[PDB]
Design a protein around this ligand. Sequence first.
Ligand SMILES: *Cc1cc2c(cc1C)nc1c(=O)[nH]c(=O)nc-1n2C[C@H](O)[C@H](O)[C@H](O)COP(=O)(O)OP(=O)(O)OC[C@H]1O[C@@H](n2cnc3c(N)ncnc32)[C@H](O)[C@@H]1O
Ligand SMILES: O=C(Nc1cc(Cl)cc(OC(F)(F)F)c1)Nc1ccccc1CCO
Length: 451
Amino acid sequence: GGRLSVDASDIAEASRDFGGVARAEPMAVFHPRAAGDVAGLVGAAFRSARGFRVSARGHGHSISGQAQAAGGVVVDMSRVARALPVHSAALGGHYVDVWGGELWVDVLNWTLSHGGLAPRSWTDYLYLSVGGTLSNAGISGQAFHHGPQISNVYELDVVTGKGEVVTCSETENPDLFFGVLGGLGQFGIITRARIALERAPKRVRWIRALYSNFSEFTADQERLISLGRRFDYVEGFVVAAEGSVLYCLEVTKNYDDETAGSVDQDVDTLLGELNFLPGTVFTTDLPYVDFLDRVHKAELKLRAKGMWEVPHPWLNLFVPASRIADFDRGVFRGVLGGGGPVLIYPMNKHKWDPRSSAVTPDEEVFYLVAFLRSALPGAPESLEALARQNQRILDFCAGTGIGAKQYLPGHKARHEWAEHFGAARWDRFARLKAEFDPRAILAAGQGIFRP
Ligand SMILES: *Cc1cc2c(cc1C)nc1c(=O)[nH]c(=O)nc-1n2C[C@H](O)[C@H](O)[C@H](O)COP(=O)(O)OP(=O)(O)OC[C@H]1O[C@@H](n2cnc3c(N)ncnc32)[C@H](O)[C@@H]1O
Ligand SMILES: O=C(Nc1cc(Cl)cc(OC(F)(F)F)c1)Nc1ccccc1CCO
């Protein structure tokens, strides 16, 4: 059903990612029409004498070659009749079946046009594949309340490393279901995901407020994620004094025709309880789709300046709330003291299922700290200096015993992976690999296992 391609542009695309550093080339790019085509290719890899590498590529947003299959085959999962949202009286809500390669932006547009429904949990950027985010976590300002995207999926169809198509959920083949979720593509290729949906808000009241005091900033973020009147989105970012560091709190209040008359007072009541700097509240009112697509608008302005297709040495850390104060002193004021955002916001561990493959710190409240800096165009030394700064951040966490965990981990050494997972989780991860991908065919670019 599918076709192997040796088109130079297809090979070049499959040999790069948003990170702009890793460049392992496959022999071919596979364009499937359906799940059975992916099953056929993985099946052939499992049966082959050499056991060539097979990796699914979402939208190629990996930082360090995680979707690359050196001298093997890259499956171009990009997109055919689409399933309509479905109501279930047993689940108490709606769901939608999506192809693993579908972009979240296309999922949103589909569910809105078919009943004004939408996923409850997002990523900041919607030009990411469903299978791609579900293999990591998929995090944004909604995760404190709904959990990451891996906590908002009912079922999957997975093509294992043996080329077998398996339907899994909490009730059917749960070890495969929970293993695949946050599983870094190690146990199979997601060909279908059954996404949880809610009736979509029509509009968003988008607020930003500034802080000079990190203790007040974090205390307000932690209080907001514990909230009943509440914001629907809680993020934050680190700001340089030139418009000394400032912290910007970023919140939203979702509303529709019914709640439009109470939105102004809900916002005012919530804001009155906060300790931001007076006169620093900035507000925007816009459609729900426009808010969700805000990062793609930043992307178009970057592509126009030749500032998008540059190296991205991005670093993402989960930091226990008990160590966040020390983190600001040594990192925001220390390492980074003196191009790209630095995001920071807490989340609730109870919204993360411990049965999944996702690795979070051993604390109920933890922060995501996202160092999203870009190197200068055509300037290799800029990338090198940013890479040294990232190593200084990791050395700082190691040196002060901060139990930080990397999100989208870029580890390569076996002892680094053992340390990342810890003994219990590593044992469960290795046993899943032995069962579902014994020949280590899948997502070898993650650098965890070898044939
Ligand atoms: C580039 C980028 C990334 C990003 C983001 C904004 C930008 C500009 N904003 C994010 C956000 O707000 N929240 C978040 O959680 N992540 C965010 N990201 C990072 C993003 O989640 C990751 O890059 C992730 O990998 C998804 O990106 P993508 O869809 O492009 O997937 P990939 O890079 O090609 O593949 C990643 C790994 O997953 C395996 N894979 C891919 N598809 C599948 C399927 N269908 N089944 C199983 N495994 C799959 C790849 O082989 C690779 O190992
Ligand atoms: O890329 C992210 N946000 C994002 C936010 C803004 Cl305002 C601009 C932006 O511009 C650019 F050019 F794309 F960088 C990106 N987020 C992300 C990335 C990886 C892991 C986790 C995260 C979630 C952190 O909330």
